[PDB]
Design an enzyme around this catalytic site. Structure first.
Site, PDB file in Angstrom:
ATOM      1  N   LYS A 155       0.959  -1.319  -0.104  1.00 25.57           N
ATOM      2  CA  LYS A 155      -0.006  -0.039  -0.214  1.00 25.57           C
ATOM      3  C   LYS A 155       0.822   1.278  -0.061  1.00 25.57           C
ATOM      4  O   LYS A 155       0.544   2.263  -0.810  1.00 25.57           O
ATOM      5  CB  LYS A 155      -0.988  -0.095   1.073  1.00 25.57           C
ATOM      6  CG  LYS A 155      -1.633   1.114   1.354  1.00 25.57           C
ATOM      7  CD  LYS A 155      -3.060   0.866   2.283  1.00 25.57           C
ATOM      8  CE  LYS A 155      -2.877   0.315   3.419  1.00 25.57           C
ATOM      9  NZ  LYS A 155      -1.836   1.105   4.326  1.00 25.57           N
ATOM     10  N   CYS A 194      27.724   3.234   9.742  1.00 24.01           N
ATOM     11  CA  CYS A 194      27.308   3.607  11.152  1.00 24.01           C
ATOM     12  C   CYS A 194      28.190   2.459  11.932  1.00 24.01           C
ATOM     13  O   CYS A 194      29.492   2.686  12.082  1.00 24.01           O
ATOM     14  CB  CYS A 194      25.898   3.462  11.459  1.00 24.01           C
ATOM     15  SG  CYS A 194      25.599   4.332  13.186  1.00 24.01           S
ATOM     16  N   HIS A 244      23.874   7.616   7.473  1.00 17.05           N
ATOM     17  CA  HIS A 244      23.014   6.434   6.841  1.00 17.05           C
ATOM     18  C   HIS A 244      22.791   7.209   5.216  1.00 17.05           C
ATOM     19  O   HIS A 244      21.889   7.375   5.163  1.00 17.05           O
ATOM     20  CB  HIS A 244      21.793   6.117   7.500  1.00 17.05           C
ATOM     21  CG  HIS A 244      22.188   5.460   8.711  1.00 17.05           C
ATOM     22  ND1 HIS A 244      21.935   3.972   8.805  1.00 17.05           N
ATOM     23  CD2 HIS A 244      22.317   5.711   9.932  1.00 17.05           C
ATOM     24  CE1 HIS A 244      22.327   3.561  10.017  1.00 17.05           C
ATOM     25  NE2 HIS A 244      22.272   4.502  10.605  1.00 17.05           N
ATOM     26  N   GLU A 254      22.018   5.399   2.736  1.00 13.41           N
ATOM     27  CA  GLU A 254      20.946   4.610   2.030  1.00 13.41           C
ATOM     28  C   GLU A 254      19.722   5.453   2.169  1.00 13.41           C
ATOM     29  O   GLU A 254      18.599   5.197   1.425  1.00 13.41           O
ATOM     30  CB  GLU A 254      20.661   3.190   2.621  1.00 13.41           C
ATOM     31  CG  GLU A 254      20.276   3.457   4.178  1.00 13.41           C
ATOM     32  CD  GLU A 254      21.462   3.223   5.328  1.00 13.41           C
ATOM     33  OE1 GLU A 254      22.579   4.035   5.058  1.00 13.41           O
ATOM     34  OE2 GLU A 254      21.130   2.827   6.128  1.00 13.41           O
TER      35      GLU A 254
END
Ligand SMILES: Nc1ccn([C@@H]2O[C@H](COP(=O)(O)OP(=O)(O)OP(=O)(O)O)[C@@H](O)[C@@H]2F)c(=O)n1
Ligand SMILES: Nc1ccn([C@@H]2O[C@H](COP(=O)(O)OP(=O)(O)OP(=O)(O)O)[C@@H](O)[C@@H]2F)c(=O)n1
Ligand SMILES: Nc1ccn([C@@H]2O[C@H](COP(=O)(O)OP(=O)(O)OP(=O)(O)O)[C@@H](O)[C@@H]2F)c(=O)n1
Ligand code: NA
Ligand code: NA
Ligand code: NA
Lengths: 534, 534, 534
Positions: free
Chosen positions: A18, A379, A506, A508
């Protein structure tokens, strides 16, 4: 013009995709020049996912403003260019926490505080707060219609639809249309019963998104239309696709965005999905193949590393490489040795907290460093890289983080306030969200990022101990990036290695399928280059 | 102009007065010059109420075309001048009977015959048949929303609304809003729950008519609007009024007709309710009072005599007489004697079947005749009046109907095919609906109807025995009316009496509060005259 | 001993295999020495499936007593040795037909006839009629819980449970537990929502049978138990098995029969499923393989030939032949010719009505006869075999059935009343159910059945024309079987052929996997023999 709201609900089951469906629709609307945002309403009582275990909920997404949010906001930022903030995600817990605080100090003036109107009013306020000043606001309602946990959200959006008016509000409902082998037919009955459930709480859906393993034929869509008081053209088939980047195209081809723009009286050009057509092309036509090992402690649930897995795949898109991600338990490296790291073209150690499996990650960073296997540490992946190096090159025996071994001789990683040297001498805060990082002029990283100053996102407490840094630097390790007045080490590199980068932030969370990411572009390239030296 | 449909549903309880509310709305729309009709969809399995005993759901109403229908069609004909026919009333039984007949002979061509679409199609076809050629069709759905029996009707009308469109269809829902003494407040919760139940079946009500023993205050109406997705002005209050003739005014004063004409885009003048204002005025301004005894076998349910009771009230309107109706069990006259017929200004014996309580009615007719108490006999009330006169004046021992005593010497009432004389000598079928009746020149009824021929409605098979009639005529009884080539006796009179009339037909079915009825106007006038003489 | 009732309901979707699951449970209880029966309650309005085309809900099953029933009774007879009759299958249509008939003639004595109690009473009476005199009665409720059509059945069985008591009644509910690829998890939400729907109608399920494409793990079963007020051991998993004969074992291995016998207080021995273990063994250990072509007009829905397909599999069991069934459209033989009948080890032409595709079957019968390919014709498959032999051997130009060409010169097949010869000279009704058939001494079938008389089941009105038979007999065709005083032709053979048989009756309705069928055993043996010869 008045702000328009699309309320996206799920029926029959969860895991309908969804988030990706809402993100895909936002992408089509953005591709029309519309100012679009998405927000996630999560029915859990956690005030935010900050406390939650990655193994249970999946990755904690971090916004620029430093909010810890559902991983779904990662889907949102990877499909539209609008930046998410705290205003784009809230939980039942946040709402009840706010209403309880207001109640205890007397803001309701001795009134009885009830789910209606007080909880529903608080929900409506946060939806208006996050939405207003946009053309179209997609509001994803977590949980399944028929469940207790989502009822206050569903009552809130029912009230909003009436208040704002049905000229500026649409209800979009995702359902499962299962295919049965025995009869060879798709079943509309679950969709029929899900719409009845949604109606029983006072919501008539305007659009049905029918999820099946194959396309829902016209006959079954006509049956759904007839039973659900929905026009046939507002019954959309969304099959199981081999790539989520196709979903924007499939929704456009069925006129979903045309129906929405008609309903909201928006005159905007045809959706230009050329960037998505490019992404679809790149993914379907890889020139090479690579095996990249992701060595971590949460591999029990891949969603724990959702954005990392996606950032790698985006690296594959920019280099036209098919990345086969091997999820390797770091605890299996402790038990069975570096035997299980053989046949990897590259190694990634993603984020994490707690000592469990960290010694395996240290071993992994060593094996990567000594065998010249491309390495990307994120990290905790940087922490174990600095530990490995200090421990095995700079000869700082048992060098560790204070997080894992508080009273170790060489705390190479520790809190700013815990900073001490090998003798116990000293000198003389959680980092969350977007922080400016200064890159070093000769570094592999400054080449890849192709800029002096980068903005990446932090979710960490334990920093590189500056008091033990020079001793690691002199042993060969290079500081590739630093940030702030405290000159905190953000990125480290190992020269005398093809590709070795570890960062505190991070990366990503900034990677998209369209614009890729410098670090992952480089990392997957180096994995390709390494794979064809064997 | 496309025909507009108003689907009227009831929730919470039955006995909301849904028929009178629908009729009253039809009366407002009629008073705007609109071509309006009403139909009743009854959830019972009976193919029609022909087989049903009047102690069940009340009197069997008879239409001009000879259809046996729900007594609600009585309410419809008393509120609008449109004549009801078989097209205005059908049952689940009728629909199933038609679909089973079609299925068995092969009309569905090997298809599986299902509630949807085959039952729902049959329902929609009958609604369209009864409705098309009108501006506004009120469709009253019998039973209560939430019950199994009504679901096929509700699914049928849901599909109609979608097919025809929401520009030409409104859903009007009646609910109970109870008053609680404990809190001195009115309760909206049942209305909330009834609307959720209606929504769960796929129907969004457009108008809510809230039934309470007092006006529903503005705050409770606003609460209902909020929870039920219904505009505040579409929440109509309808208290329990002292007179049903006030209801059209109350609905108009709340803008119900204005809202309906707006939604249906009807340019028609403001409603002139002068005719209803006049009836209200007449009813509120009586000059005298009479007590009319109604002696029957169904008094345990007054609605067994709905149209008769209403016809007596209309007679009262036309004479400005307040009519006190005393329902008297005919079986109590068999036990306790004529003692209970004392203090009566007039006696009415209405229709009925079966011998039970008939001897009490014969005694009642005798008492009315001998003490010169005004008497109206309807169908059975005529039979027992003929029997009374045959026994006690024409001296025919044990004179009776073949319905009760098949083999009596003097069958003064019998089927045409059973007609015999005292010695058993003979001459060489159900009557339903409007039949012409020839009135005799020097008769009381000829001067009341002021015409030689009248049209009245029949429901009986047992006729006056013409073979024994000549004997009763010589004894003093006057035939006031006959019909057909069989010269069947329709009306009789006792001319040595102030007012003694009895008819085969049901005059009560053509009596309206606006246009009254000649026969009942005369009966109540005679009762007023008798009251004055005491 | 009081008769025990197991009410079997389905939720989420239809096509759960509810009939086979009920049959399999009946087979376990049968294998415990219990007197068990099954009945099917079908929610369709058809009084019976006699009028229904086989492309709808599949083949019309015929019982011994000549009842046309749901094909589910086929499943029942193939799993238990109790013979099905009209008492074992009824529809909504049948119930309404009976109640409307009773109402119209006056049996309800002036009562309002309602779904409750009159329809529900009629349903309970038929369940008690079909059930009483057994230890355990399985009552399969057709349709899906949540649908309108099944509500009268569900209300009926709710009332039965209360009346009879919960010591002698169990509710067994089948649900879908879908597998989602995205999360690699199985979903209990549909089961939760289906149980809530069943509860909202007033039925607490006692047992949940969860249908999934794999076993439902213990954690998901425990979750279902928790949310559905059902004991953990009463949550049964039923995966999609490669063979339906394994289902009785799977249900037994989860203690379903143990739970049922405990709840019903039945002291009966452990189930001996040796007969089912044997069938499973036979099926899993074939020695050879054959391809049998089934040439018909209903191939678009295989369940049109359910019992025939199963009968061929049973023949395979009895010869240890793996039967590959190729469904071939007879209309494709009309267009593309006998080209598509190549590579067939045997040809079966099953029953049917209407001329569409018949000329393709006549061509198919010719091809099988001339190329000595084993042939079984059933009903229409016999008609087209007689037509083939009449045209191409007995030289009767355009020889046909009166069903297709009413006025052909050679009506070799026709109604007994239409029987004429080539010149139009004459001699001086539906056959349903078990009829005795006399077998001829020197016939293939006489040696397969190894008895002079057989009982087989009919469903046809069009017979072999005895007036044209003598001409076809002289041309070489052998009558292998006749029945009645009218000496109607039941079986024919082409004796210049390895295996060519065609019967009027439906042998497939008496074929079971345990006891097989002589005719089909022989047909598949002949197909094996033919396969070897190539
Ligand atoms: N509110 C409803 C909806 C449906 N029905 C009934 O449903 C039956 C078809 O039975 P089906 O299992 O085939 O269900 P279907 O509607 O086709 O959806 P699906 O197969 O794609 O899942 C049909 O007699 C009837 F329409 C119903 O009774 N009440
Ligand atoms: N779908 C709903 C609707 C309402 N509520 C709650 O209902 C409570 C008031 O409880 P009440 O008995 O006073 O009911 P109310 O709504 O005033 O109608 P009324 O019958 O009194 O006129 C109030 O905390 C809250 F609104 C609810 O939980 N879920
Ligand atoms: N009457 C109910 C039942 C459940 N809930 C909620 O449901 C959520 C889990 O949401 P899920 O999609 O994971 O559903 P789950 O129950 O695991 O079954 P499954 O399909 O996944 O196997 C969980 O916060 C909570 F249990 C609810 O609100 N009201
Ligand atoms: Na279906
Ligand atoms: Na209240
Ligand atoms: Na779950």
């Amino acid at each position: 013009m008045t702000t328009n709201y699309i309320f996206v609900t799920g029926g029959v089951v969860s895991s309908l995709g969804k988030g990706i469906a809402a993100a895909s629709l936002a992408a089509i609307l953005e591709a029309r020049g519309l100012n679009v945002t998405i927000m996630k309403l999560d029915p859990y009582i956690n005030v935010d996912p900050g406390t939650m275990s990655p193994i249970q909920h999946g990755e904690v997404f971090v916004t620029e403003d430093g909010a810890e949010t559902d991983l779904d906001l990662g889907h949102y930022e990877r499909f539209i260019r609008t930046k998410m903030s705290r205003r784009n995600n809230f939980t039942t817990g946040r709402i009840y926490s706010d209403v309880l605080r207001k109640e205890r100090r007397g803001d309701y003036l001795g009134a009885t505080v009830q789910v209606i109107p007080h909880i529903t009013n608080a929900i409506k306020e946060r939806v208006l707060e996050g939405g207003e000043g946009h053309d179209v606001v997609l509001v994803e309602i977590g949980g399944t219609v028929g469940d207790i946990e989502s009822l206050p959200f569903l009552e809130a959006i029912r009230q909003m639809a009436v208040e704002i008016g049905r000229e500026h509000t649409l209800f979009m409902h995702l359902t499962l249309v299962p295919y049965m082998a025995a009869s060879g037919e798709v079943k509309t009955k679950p969709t029929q019963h899900s719409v009845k459930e949604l109606l029983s709480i006072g919501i008539q859906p305007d659009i049905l998104i029918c999820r099946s393993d194959r396309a829902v034929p016209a006959n079954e869509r006509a049956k759904i239309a007839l039973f659900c008081n929905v026009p046939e053209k507002a019954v959309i088939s969304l099959k199981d696709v081999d790539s989520i980047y196709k979903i924007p195209g499939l929704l456009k081809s069925q006129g979903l965005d045309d129906y929405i723009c008609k309903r909201f009286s928006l005159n905007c050009p045809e959706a230009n999905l050329s960037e998505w057509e490019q992404v679809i092309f790149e993914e379907a036509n890889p020139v090479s193949e690579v095996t990249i090992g992701m060595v971590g402690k949460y591999i029990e649930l891949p969603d724990a590393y959702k954005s990392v897995i996606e950032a790698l795949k985006h690296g594959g898109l920019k280099n036209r490489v098919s990345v086969n991600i091997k999820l390797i338990d770091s605890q299996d490296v402790e038990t069975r040795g570096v035997e299980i790291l053989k046949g990897l073209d590259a190694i990634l150690v993603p984020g994490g907290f707690g000592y469990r499996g960290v010694e395996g990650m240290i071993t992994t960073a060593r094996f990567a460093r000594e065998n010249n296997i491309p390495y990307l540490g994120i990290c905790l992946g940087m922490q174990v890289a600095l530990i490995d190096y200090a421990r095995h090159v700079a000869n700082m025996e048992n060098a560790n983080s204070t997080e894992f071994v508080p009273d170790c001789k060489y705390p190479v990683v520790a809190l700013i306030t815990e900073w001490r040297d090998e003798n116990g001498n000293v000198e003389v805060t959680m980092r969350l969200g977007a922080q400016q990082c200064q890159l070093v002029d000769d570094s592999l990283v400054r080449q890849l990022y192709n800029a002096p100053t980068i903005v990446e996102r932090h979710r960490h407490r334990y920093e590189v101990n500056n008091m033990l840094l020079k001793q690691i630097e002199d042993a060969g390790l290079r500081v590739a990036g630093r940030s702030g007045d405290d000159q905190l080490v953000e990125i480290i590199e190992v020269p005398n290695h093809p590709w070795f980068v570890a960062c505190q932030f991070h990366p990503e969370f900034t990677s998209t399928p369209r614009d890729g990411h410098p670090l992952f572009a480089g990392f997957v390239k180096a994995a390709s280059e390494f794979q064809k030296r064997q």
